[PDB]
Amino acid sequence: GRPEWIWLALGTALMGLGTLYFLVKGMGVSDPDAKKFYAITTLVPAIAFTMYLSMLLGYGLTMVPFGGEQNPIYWARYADWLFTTPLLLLDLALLVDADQGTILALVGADGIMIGTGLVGALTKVYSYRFVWWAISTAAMLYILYVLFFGFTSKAESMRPEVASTFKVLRNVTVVLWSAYPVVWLIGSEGAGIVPLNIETLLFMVLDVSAKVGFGLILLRSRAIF
Ligand SMILES: CCC[C@@H](C)[C@H]1CC[C@H]2[C@@H]3[C@H](O)C[C@@H]4C[C@H](O)CC[C@]4(C)[C@H]3C[C@H](O)[C@]12C
Ligand SMILES: *C/C=C(C)/C=C/C=C(C)/C=C/C1=C(C)CCCC1(C)C
Ligand SMILES: CCCCCCCCCCCCCCCC
Ligand SMILES: CCCCCCCCCCCCCCCC
Ligand SMILES: CCCCCCCCCCCC
Ligand SMILES: CCCCCCCCCCCC
Ligand SMILES: CCCCCCCCCCCC
Ligand SMILES: CCCCCCCCCC
Ligand SMILES: CCCCCCCCCC
Ligand SMILES: CCCCCCCCCC
Ligand SMILES: CCCCCCCCCC
Ligand SMILES: CCCCCCCCCC
Ligand SMILES: CCCCCCCCC
Ligand SMILES: CCCCCCCCC
Ligand SMILES: CCCCCCCC
Ligand SMILES: CCCCCCC
C-alpha cells in the first residue's frame, strides 16, 4: 500500500543514479559544445528524479471519478514530461542544427501533447478522456514525423558520426514515445485493463530508457564534441 511504490522507488534510484553520473562526467568536460549537451541531458533525469520522489512519498496523486469508480491518477508524471520532453527534443535539434521555427513548432506541439494528455487524465466523462488522448497522440505523431523525415534530412548534411548518433537516438525515441499512448490507453487512465502497479512498472521502464538510456547513448558519443 500503495502497491506501485516498489517501481516508484526503483525509478527514483535509477533517475538519481543517472543524474549523478551525468553530472560527474559533465563537470569534467572542457569542450563548450559538449557542455550544452551535458547540461540539457543532466536536467532530464534530475526533473524525473524530483517527480518520482514526490510520487513515492505520496504527492501528485488525485482521484478522478469516471466509469462509476474513483480512479487514482498520478498527475505529477505530466509536470515531469512537460519539461523533460522538450529538453530531449532540444538535444536532438541541437545535434542536427534544426532551425528556430522547427524547434518552436516541436516544443509547441510537445506542450499540446502533454497538456491535452493531462486534461484527458482528469476528465470525468469517460468518453471525452479518449477525445483528449486522440488530440495528444496526433500532436505526438506530428513530432515523430518531423524527427523522422525532417531531422534525418538535416542530419545527413552533418559528418557521418553525427548522423549515425542521430539515427540511433531518433530510433530509440520513435520506439519509446510510441508506446506511451498505448500504456495510457490500456492502463488506469483509459480502459483500465492493466492495473496501476503493472502500468507504473511500464512507465518506469519507458522513462528510464527514454531519459537515462537516451543520455548514455548521446553523452558517450563523439558527436557532441
Ligand atoms: C503521517 C505518516 C505519513 C508518512 C510517514 C508516510 C506517507 C508516505 C509513506 C511512504 C510511502 O508510502 C512509500 C513507502 C511504502 C513502504 O510500504 C514503507 C516505506 C515508505 C517509504 C512509506 C513510509 C511512510 O509510511 C510514509 C513516508
Ligand atoms: C521522459 C519521458 C518521456 C520521453 C515521455 C514521453 C511521453 C509521451 C510521448 C507521452 C505521450 C502521451 C500521449 C501521446 C497520449 C496520451 C498522454 C501521454 C502524455 C501518455
Ligand atoms: C517493507 C518496507 C520496505 C521499506 C524500504 C523503503 C526504501 C525505499 C526507498 C529507497 C530506494 C532505493 C531502494 C531500491 C528499491 C527497493
Ligand atoms: C507532405 C505530405 C504530407 C503527408 C502527411 C502524413 C501525415 C501522417 C503521419 C503520422 C505518422 C508519422 C510517424 C513517423 C514515422 C516514425
Ligand atoms: C543537482 C543537479 C544539477 C543538474 C543541473 C546541471 C545543468 C544546469 C545548468 C544551467 C546553466 C548553466
Ligand atoms: C509548421 C506547422 C506548424 C504546426 C503546429 C503544431 C501542430 C500540432 C498538431 C495538431 C494537434 C491537434
Ligand atoms: C527493469 C525492471 C525489471 C522488470 C521486472 C520484470 C517483471 C515481473 C514483475 C511482475 C509484476 C509484479
Ligand atoms: C543530484 C540530485 C538533485 C535533485 C534534488 C532536488 C530535491 C527537491 C525535492 C522537492
Ligand atoms: C492523425 C495524425 C495527424 C498528424 C499530422 C502530421 C502532419 C505532418 C506534417 C506535414
Ligand atoms: C544500432 C541500433 C539502432 C536501432 C535501435 C532500435 C532499438 C530501440 C530500443 C528499444
Ligand atoms: C502490453 C503489456 C500488457 C501486459 C499487462 C497485461 C496483464 C494484466 C494483468 C491482469
Ligand atoms: C534501449 C536502452 C538503451 C541502452 C543504452 C545503453 C548503451 C550505451 C552504450 C553505447
Ligand atoms: C508554431 C510556430 C511555427 C513557426 C514556423 C516554422 C514552421 C516550420 C516547420
Ligand atoms: C483544441 C481543440 C479543442 C477540442 C475540445 C473538444 C472537447 C470535447 C468536450
Ligand atoms: C514496453 C515497451 C518495450 C520496451 C523496450 C525497451 C527496453 C529496453
Ligand atoms: C562505480 C562504477 C561506475 C564507473 C564509472 C567510472 C569510475
Which residue, among 51, 23, 19, 16, has the nearest Cα to 203 in the 3D structure? 51
d(Cα 118, Cα 82) in Å, to the nearest integer? 10
The approach used to solve this structure was X-ray
The Cα–Cα gap between 200 and 4 comes to 6
Burial code (b: 16+ CB inside 10 Å, e: under 16) for 114-142 equals: bbbbbbbbbbeeeeebeebbebbbebbeb
Residues 6 or more apart whose Cβ sits within 8 Å of residue 164: 223
Determine the Cα–Cα distance for residues 173 and 91; give it in Å rounded to an integer. Answer: 12
Neighbouring CB atoms inside 10 A of 222's CB total: 11
In testing the pocket of ligand 1, which one of 8, 53, 55, 57 has its CB within 8 Å of the most ligand atoms?
57
SS3 85: helix
Ligand 6 centroid to residue 116 C-alpha, Å: 13
Q: Whose CA is nearest to atom 4 of ligand 11?
A: 194
Q: Name the phi and psi angles at 44, rounded to 5.
A: -65, -55
Q: How far apart are the first and last CA of the chain?
A: 47
Atom of ligand 3 nearest to the CA of 9: 11
Burial class of 3 by CB neighbour count within 10 A (0 to 12, 13 to 18, 19+)? exposed
Do 130 and 190 form a contact (C-beta atoms < 8 A)? yes
The reported resolution of this PDB entry, expressed in Å, is 2.3
Residue 223 CA to residue 161 CA, distance in Å, equals 6
Q: Do 169 and 148 touch, CB atoms closer than 8 A?
A: no
What nine digits make up the cell of 115?
497538456
Is the distance from CB of 210 to CB of 176 less than 8 angstroms? Answer: yes
Range of the domain at 59: 1-225
Of 203, 219, 190, the residue nearest 21 (C-alpha): 219
Residue with the smallest CA separation from ligand 7 atom 7 is 201
At residue 62, φ and ψ (nearest 5 deg) are: -130, 165
For 99: left if phi > 0, alpha if psi spans -120 to 50, otherwise beta; the answer is beta
Place of cell 553525427: 162
Grid coordinates representing 28? 569534467
Distance 178 CA to ligand 2 centre (A): 8
Is residue 221 left, alpha or beta, with left meaning phi > 0 and alpha meaning psi from -120 to 50?
beta
Q: Which region, left, alpha or beta, applies to residue 86 given φ > 0 means left and ψ of -120 to 50 means alpha?
A: alpha
For 75, phi and psi rounded to 5 degrees?
A: -90, -20
- Mutation choice for ligand 3 from 2, 5, 7, 12, CB with most ligand atoms inside 8 A: 12
| Rg of the chain over all Cα atoms, to the nearest angstrom | 18
How many domains is the chain partitioned into structurally?
A: 1
Residue reference for cell 540511433: 168
Listed as own residue / partner, the contacts of 33-36 with beta carbons closer than 8 Å and 24 or more positions apart are 33/224, 33/225, 34/224, 34/225, 36/94
Long-range pairs, 155-159, Cβ under 8 A, ≥24: 155/95, 155/96, 158/95, 158/96
CATH of residue 199: 1.20.1070.10
Burial per residue of 41-75, b for 16 or more beta-carbon CB atoms within 10 angstroms, e otherwise? bbbbbbbbbbbbbbbbeeebeeebebeeeeeebbe
188 vs 84: CA distance, rounded Å: 23
Pocket probe mutation, ligand 8, options 49, 51, 84, max atoms within 8 Å of Cβ: 49
